[PDB]
Structures are given as C-alpha cells and as structure tokens.
Design a protein around this ligand. Structure first.
Ligand SMILES: *Cc1c(COP(=O)(O)O)cnc(C)c1O
Ligand SMILES: [Cl-]
Ligand SMILES: [Cl-]
Ligand SMILES: [Cl-]
Ligand SMILES: [Cl-]
Ligand SMILES: [Cl-]
Ligand SMILES: [Cl-]
Ligand SMILES: [Cl-]
Ligand SMILES: [Cs+]
Ligand SMILES: [Cs+]
Lengths: 395, 256
C-alpha cells in the first residue's frame, strides 16, 4: 500500500522496477512524518529564510503595462539564492535525506541547473553529493560542471548508451537501487514516481503562498490569473498550489513551443503529446507513433523535456488549469522587453511565462486584469544564447 | 504460458534445471540476431528471454544499454521485433519465449492489443521491467486473457507480503534476484508460486549448478550472452562459435 494517493486522476503512479519500491515507500513515510513534525518545518523555514533569502519580492512592473488595463506583478524567484526556484525544494529534500539517516545525495543532470542546486544544498548540509552526467554533457557544460565541483560534488561522467541524460539518469537510479539505505535520490522537478510530484509541490508551495499574501496586502484581492512556465512542472505547481481552491483565480502553465508546434520542434507534451509511461509515471509525453520517446526542443534548456509532471496533466483534464505554448521568438522578445523596461534580466525559461502575460495584455489592452508571473529565475546564464541569436539574424 | 508448464515438467522428469539466455532482438542486426537466437536454442537453451529496443531504458545496466543502442543502429523497431518473434516461434514449437518490455511499448497502442499481438506471434510470457506488482493489474489481466504468463521479479529486498503477491500474480516462472536464498525459494514454493529462475549475475557454470542445488528450477543469464556479442562484433562466425560454447557449458551445469 501507500500512505498517500500516488495518482492525480489517471496520471502519476509508481512505474519503477520492483527493487526501487522500498526506497519510494521509505521516502513517502519520511515525508508524511516530516510534514507533521514542527521541528522539521522550523528547520526548513530557517534554511529558506536565512540561507535562501525568502520571502522573495513581488515586483509591480509599471513601464511594461503603461497605457493598458493590465496590472502585472512578478514573483521574484530570480532573487532566491542560486538564481532560481530550484533551491527551495532541494533544501527540503536534503533535510528529508538527513531525516532518513542518510549522508549521501545522488542526482543526475543534463545542462547542469539541477546539478548545481543539488550540489549547493549538499554543501550547506554536509552531505556527500554525486551527480551523474552523460560524458557528452560534461564536455558541453564546463561552467556548471565547475560550479558543481567547486561546491564539492563528485561529477561522474557516464559513457554507456548514448552518454547523455537518459544514461546518467539510469546510472543514478541503478546506484540508488543499491545504495538507498545510505543515499537519497534528489529528483529535480514535480515529476517521476510517487512520492516525488507530491513532495516537490509541497516543497515549492511557498511560491504561491507568499504571492497570495503579498497580493492581498498590495491589491486587497486575489489575482485574476497566475502564469508560470512548465518544464517538468515544479515552479508552476509551486505557484498554483495555494490557489487551486480559489476557483476565481486562473492557473496558466506555459510550455515551450520551440520553433513552432507545427514544426514538431517543441517541448509541449501536455497539449501536443500523448499519454505514456516513462520515468516512473503515466503522463503526457512526446512520442513516436510506435511509442518511442521523441526528442524535445526549446531555446531554453530548463524547459527542454518531452514530458511533464502528472498533477499538471490532471489539472488540465478537469479544466482547473489551462496550458498554452510560447515560441523561442516570443520568449526572446519578452526577455528583451524585461531588460529594457524593468532592468531585470529574466531566465529564458521564465521569459516564456512573461511572453504569455504580455500577449494577454497586448491582445486585449482595455481588459482589466491583475496578473502574476512566476519569474522562476535570472537570465545571466542566457546572455550568450541571446547575443548569438540576435547577432545571427543581424539585429 | 503452457509451454513453461510442459518444459518444467519435462525438466523435472530429467532431474534437470532450466538454462535461459537473454538477448536483445535485432542486436547487432536483424539477420545476425536470428542466427544468434537459433544458435542459443541449438546449443541447449531451454527457453529465451528477448528484449525489444526502447529509446530511453531506465532499468538496464551498461552491457544491455549498449546492446539497446546497437539495435537502434540497425534501425530495429517494435514492429520488426514482432516479425522476428513470429519467425522464431515458427522454427521452434516448444521453446518458451519470454519478452522483456518497457511499459510504454506495452501501453503505446493499448495494453490489450499488445498482449493480443504477443499471443498471435506465439510469445509465452512478458516481464514488464518498470511495472511493480503494485501497478501490475491491467498488465496481468491482459496477459492472462491472451494466454500470456505475466512474469514478476522477486527482489533480494522482498518481504512476506511481496512474496505472497508475486506468488499469487505471476505465472510461467518467478524471476528471482538473489533474506537467505534457499529460504526465498522455500517460501515461494509454500505460496504455490511459478517455478523460480535465479537471475542475479549468472555468468558461469558453477552458478547454474548452485541455483539447482538451492532448489530453483533453473537460471537466467541476464547479460553474459550480450557481452559475448559485444566482444565479437567484427567476427560473426567467431561470435556464433563462442555463444555455442558458452550455452553448451551453462546447460551442462544444469544437468545435476
Ligand atoms: C529548472 C527551471 C525551470 C523549469 O523547471 P520546472 O520544474 O518546470 O519549474 C524553469 N525556470 C527556471 C529558471 C529553471 O531553472
Ligand atoms: Cl492513500
Ligand atoms: Cl505540523
Ligand atoms: Cl510556526
Ligand atoms: Cl561531505
Ligand atoms: Cl494565511
Ligand atoms: Cl502462480
Ligand atoms: Cl545479468
Ligand atoms: Cs497599467
Ligand atoms: Cs516540457
């Protein structure tokens, strides 16, 4: 049995080899215990406040909306230690590892953002961190590899299979299957097998909780909609969770449209994929006709995955949340717009969320609407990508 | 599943264990794979476990990962694998054929239709690598409706409830990855489980004889056959010779 429901409607589950089920059951029990433990909550609150810097600002952006009836706030997860919302939940999961008596963390990484978050939580809490990374990825990610190594993590090149993310994830889970007595697998989004979608949501829900309190203080009401980008689904579920029962509040998730949905080069499985079973979950995924998992694409590495967390699929299915897509070109324009008009350099991931809010405004400029964008991270990492694109097309 | 029942009854009459090799279908290409599989049976394999190449396997070790990737290099698709399976069955009427699948390839075009295709081509069992007993209901049910044995792994970390479930739900054989080994075997028998095949790192004759002494019904070699394929890619002839030698030796060890 489980203590909690592993499913969101038809989506989710625990589709792992039998050997991993005790590890998932152990983690579920420790999470359920922790959530009832005031000392755990106080330790987590302490790290979020005094180490990560919560609460994060809620910024009202006036220049962008001038001359329209849109009021736009940005929830500043870009200001969290580490430069993105990822820090929130890795701190929680590190505390869970310690609760289970573990001193070691396993993670895998492709572009390296979750690897850096895992390494920083591990460094602070004195945990021995090993991050599996496909050999092809190590070669292409020197900056992130260096950050992880500076923070004392062991970055382990994986050369088997295609020597990329899949192969690193396999090796990490193979490791975990043997070492789960002493090591915790630190999954980097609200996806994978139960209990991870549940844990990651609960360890990100302060995004939406703070946003609600801040918007009640500033505007004396709830937002008309909250808007978040969707890679695996963690920042969006963290923003949405505290508003799910506030039926008047729109929940808008923005998937990457890449070069355009019609090109097939995108990462929008929730609206343009097909339910499948992979990575421990039944969830929308981008699939070949014969059930191979397709390669996704986005200008933004953080969004570039062919699946999504199961709670998003469920919220979509019942009509509680709506999901849209934004192309590379739309995200780039939003990125330039925020830099010029607000002095904030946004992550290209977050730029997808801002692009959709800008469209809601520009399409209907006399519509009264109070919007919050989850600004999931800062975009220092993206300036070379942006420069290279702008230079290539001559602008 | 009846091919397993008949096999184990015959082995029991010969006081013999089963030896079951694993290979990836289409590794290193379709025609070499068919030749490999014929060689395994000719050399004494009692049954086969056959993998279908999958784009993103998250439950296979390096040796198998590499085989998976080779079969893609040959452009091997699930459709082609099922063409191969019908051929194999047409040549070998009694050899039990088991598949080792990832869930998405079973779920893709409907679970029922997957098992119906297995039945049409004459597959006997399916082990779905990433479906634990807890999630197994629709797979088990579709397997049984189409006369396919659902195979479950009994892990080393297994508790009594899990032993009872695997014993209740499985057919054909129980896949043992090995509480004390002979104890697991005794409990599985107490619970009327499908006969146990030990599959933990089986690479030498003495492990086959050990399995038989422990009272398992035989042994599965999850990766040793694949290693031979990998070592011998440049010489197909030598590849078949070494596979014949290995399987001969392993089967000899089962005759206990
Ligand atoms: C990782 C990341 C994302 C995407 O991950 P989610 O789990 O969908 O939140 C989005 N924005 C930034 C800045 C990220 O680093
Ligand atoms: Cl429950
Ligand atoms: Cl509490
Ligand atoms: Cl308190
Ligand atoms: Cl350490
Ligand atoms: Cl409150
Ligand atoms: Cl049985
Ligand atoms: Cl093996
Ligand atoms: Cs305005
Ligand atoms: Cs995605």
């Amino acid at each position: 049995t489980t203590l909690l429901n592993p499913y969101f409607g038809e989506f989710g589950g625990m589709y792992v080899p039998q050997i991993l089920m005790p590890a998932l059951n152990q983690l579920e029990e420790a999470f359920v215990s922790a959530q009832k433990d005031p000392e755990f909550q106080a330790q987590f609150a302490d790290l979020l406040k005094n180490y990560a810097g919560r609460p994060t600002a809620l910024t009202k952006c006036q220049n962008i909306t001038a001359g329209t009836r849109t009021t736009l706030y940005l929830k500043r997860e870009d200001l969290l230690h580490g430069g993105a919302h990822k820090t929130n939940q890795v701190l929680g999961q590190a505390l869970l590892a310690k609760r289970m008596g573990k001193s070691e963390i396993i993670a895998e990484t492709g572009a390296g953002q979750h690897g850096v978050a895992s390494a920083l939580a591990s460094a602070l809490l004195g945990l021995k961190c090993r991050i599996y990374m496909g050999a092809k990825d190590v070669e292409r990610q020197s900056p992130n590899v260096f950050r992880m190594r500076l923070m004392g993590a062991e970055v382990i090149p994986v050369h088997s299979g295609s020597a990329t993310l899949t192969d690193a994830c396999n090796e990490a889970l193979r490791d975990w299957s043997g070492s789960y007595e002493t090591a915790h697998y630190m999954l980097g989004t609200a996806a994978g097998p139960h209990p991870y979608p549940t844990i990651v949501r609960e360890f990100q829900r302060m995004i939406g909780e703070e946003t609600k309190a801040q918007i009640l203080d500033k505007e004396g009401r709830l937002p008309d909609a909250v808007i978040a980008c969707v890679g695996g689904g963690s920042n969006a579920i963290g923003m949405f969770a505290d508003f799910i029962n506030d039926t008047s509040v729109g929940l808008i998730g923005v998937e990457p449209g890449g070069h355009g949905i019609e090109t097939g080069e995108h990462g929008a499985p929730l609206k343009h994929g097909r339910v499948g079973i992979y990575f421990g979950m039944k969830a929308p995924m981008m699939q070949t006709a014969d059930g191979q998992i397709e390669e996704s694409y986005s200008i933004s590495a953080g969004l570039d995955f062919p699946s999504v967390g199961p709670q998003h699929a469920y919220l979509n299915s019942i009509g509680r949340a709506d999901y849209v897509s934004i192309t590379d070109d739309e995200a780039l324009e939003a990125f330039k717009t925020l830099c010029r008009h607000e002095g904030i350099i946004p992550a290209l991931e977050s730029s997808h969320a801002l692009a959709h809010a800008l469209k809601m405004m520009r399409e209907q400029p006399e519509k009264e609407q109070l919007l919050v964008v989850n600004l999931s991270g800062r975009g220092d990492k993206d300036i070379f990508t942006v420069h290279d694109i702008l230079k290539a097309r001559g602008e | 599943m009846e091919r397993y029942e008949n096999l184990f009854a015959q082995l029991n009459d010969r006081r013999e264990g089963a030896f079951v090799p694993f290979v990836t279908l289409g590794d290193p290409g379709i025609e070499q794979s068919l030749k490999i599989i014929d060689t395994l049976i000719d050399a004494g394999a009692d049954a086969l476990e056959l993998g279908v190449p999958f784009s993103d396997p998250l439950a296979d070790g390096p040796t198998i990962q590499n085989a998976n990737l080779r079969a893609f290099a040959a452009g091997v698709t699930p459709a082609q694998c099922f063409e191969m399976l019908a051929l194999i069955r047409e040549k070998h009427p009694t050899i039990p054929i088991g598949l080792l699948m990832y869930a998405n390839l079973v779920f893709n075009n409907g679970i029922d239709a997957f098992y119906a295709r297995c039945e049409q081509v004459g597959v006997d069992s399916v082990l779905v690598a990433d479906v634990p007993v807890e999630e197994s209901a629709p797979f088990r049910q579709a397997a049984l409706r189409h006369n396919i044995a659902p195979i479950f792994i009994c892990p080393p970390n297994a508790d009594d409830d899990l032993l009872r479930q695997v014993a209740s739900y499985g057919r054909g054989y129980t896949y043992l990855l090995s509480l004390p080994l002979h104890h697991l075997i005794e409990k599985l028998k107490e619970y009327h489980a499908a006969p146990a095949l030990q599959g933990f790192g089986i690479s030498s004759p003495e492990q086959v004889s050990a399995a038989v002494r422990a009272g398992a019904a035989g042994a599965i070699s999850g990766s040793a056959i694949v290693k031979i394929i990998e070592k011998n890619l440049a010489s197909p002839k030598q590849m078949l010779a070494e596979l014949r030698s290995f399987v001969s030796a392993m089967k000899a060890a089962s005759r206990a």
